[PDB]
Amino acid sequence: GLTHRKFGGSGGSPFSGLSSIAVRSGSALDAIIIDGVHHGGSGGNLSPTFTFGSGEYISNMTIRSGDAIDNISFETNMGRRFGPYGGSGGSANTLSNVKVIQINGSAGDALDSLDIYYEQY
Amino acid sequence: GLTHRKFGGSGGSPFSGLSSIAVRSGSALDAIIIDGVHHGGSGGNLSPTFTFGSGEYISNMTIRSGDAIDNISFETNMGRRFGPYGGSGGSANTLSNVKVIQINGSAGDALDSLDIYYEQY
Ligand SMILES: OC[C@H]1O[C@H](O)[C@@H](O)[C@@H](O)[C@@H]1O
Ligand SMILES: OC[C@H]1O[C@H](O)[C@@H](O)[C@@H](O)[C@@H]1O
Ligand SMILES: OC[C@H]1O[C@H](O)[C@@H](O)[C@@H](O)[C@@H]1O
Ligand SMILES: OC[C@H]1O[C@H](O)[C@@H](O)[C@@H](O)[C@@H]1O
Ligand SMILES: OC[C@H]1O[C@H](O)[C@@H](O)[C@@H](O)[C@@H]1O
Ligand SMILES: OC[C@H]1O[C@H](O)[C@@H](O)[C@@H](O)[C@@H]1O
Numbered sequence: 001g002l003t004h005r006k007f008g009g010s011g012g013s014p015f016s017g018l019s020s021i022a023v024r025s026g027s028a029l030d031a032i033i034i035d036g037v038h039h040g041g042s043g044g045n046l047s048p049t050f051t052f053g054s055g056e057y058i059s060n061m062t063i064r065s066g067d068a069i070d071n072i073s074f075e076t077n078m079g080r081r082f083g084p085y086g087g088s089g090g091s092a093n094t095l096s097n098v099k100v101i102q103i104n105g106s107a108g109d110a111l112d113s114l115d116i117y118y119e120q121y
Numbered sequence: 122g123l124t125h126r127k128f129g130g131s132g133g134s135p136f137s138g139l140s141s142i143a144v145r146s147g148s149a150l151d152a153i154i155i156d157g158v159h160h161g162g163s164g165g166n167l168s169p170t171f172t173f174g175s176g177e178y179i180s181n182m183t184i185r186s187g188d189a190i191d192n193i194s195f196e197t198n199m200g201r202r203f204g205p206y207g208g209s210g211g212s213a214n215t216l217s218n219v220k221v222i223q224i225n226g227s228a229g230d231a232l233d234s235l236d237i238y239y240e241q242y
Contacts, residue, residue, distance in 0.1 A: 008234030
């Protein structure tokens, strides 16, 4: 199953492999750009990129979805916020008091799905 | 606490958020560059960038570590191989038959620690 293992010591400043998120969005999610890699189509407007600082991670996240992704918003453990971007369709699902680890999904001309890997607190 | 949740529908082509890895290495790990972002110092030599192909992922990995990261090697489900890069310090830790989902860690002037998130098959 899903698991996590740490290697090394205690020094240094923390970093996350999930380093930046942007979206293209209109009334729905046309694309998500994860660490600079584009996933989806070219519709909508390109949001400015959210780039995480050291020790910063998504701690709350609302995704509206139906047969596709309609809307994304999140807040980090530092209190910074992204979105909401997208429209009011689908229905909202919220992750509360989490640490998002990775954002995978599926995309074509639009953002069909997201697979969110996170730690639940 | 580590889990995952899927939102949205069935369409599109799958994508993974972890897309490329390079390292700076000498007798140990000086830096890791994940999805294009540099974490760590300026010592050692910069490795070529390993860019994951469509549907490719780390399936087997060895990390040598003590108080820092001493060496990294991995192999993928497409038979590709990365490293070993680094030295002989620390102790070997081996992941067998996995799918690496994400790499977090900690770095200053060197690579202090790695947090590997993976599915264990
Ligand atoms: O988000 C779906 C759709 O929303 C609006 O119609 C416009 O912004 C389009 O460009 C976009 O494709
Ligand atoms: O998610 C795409 C689309 O899927 C379904 O048709 C409904 O939930 C809509 O409200 C939503 O906009
Ligand atoms: O992403 C919207 C849509 O784009 C393309 O038509 C295909 O990839 C579909 O599978 C996908 O559902
Ligand atoms: O990797 C640890 C260390 O190895 C060698 O001594 C050199 O390449 C250094 O620049 C590097 O920092
Ligand atoms: O990890 C850096 C360093 O940490 C400890 O001192 C020992 O495990 C060494 O063998 C190792 O090289
Ligand atoms: O990365 C090696 C070393 O570099 C810097 O001195 C600091 O970030 C330390 O915490 C770290 O252990």
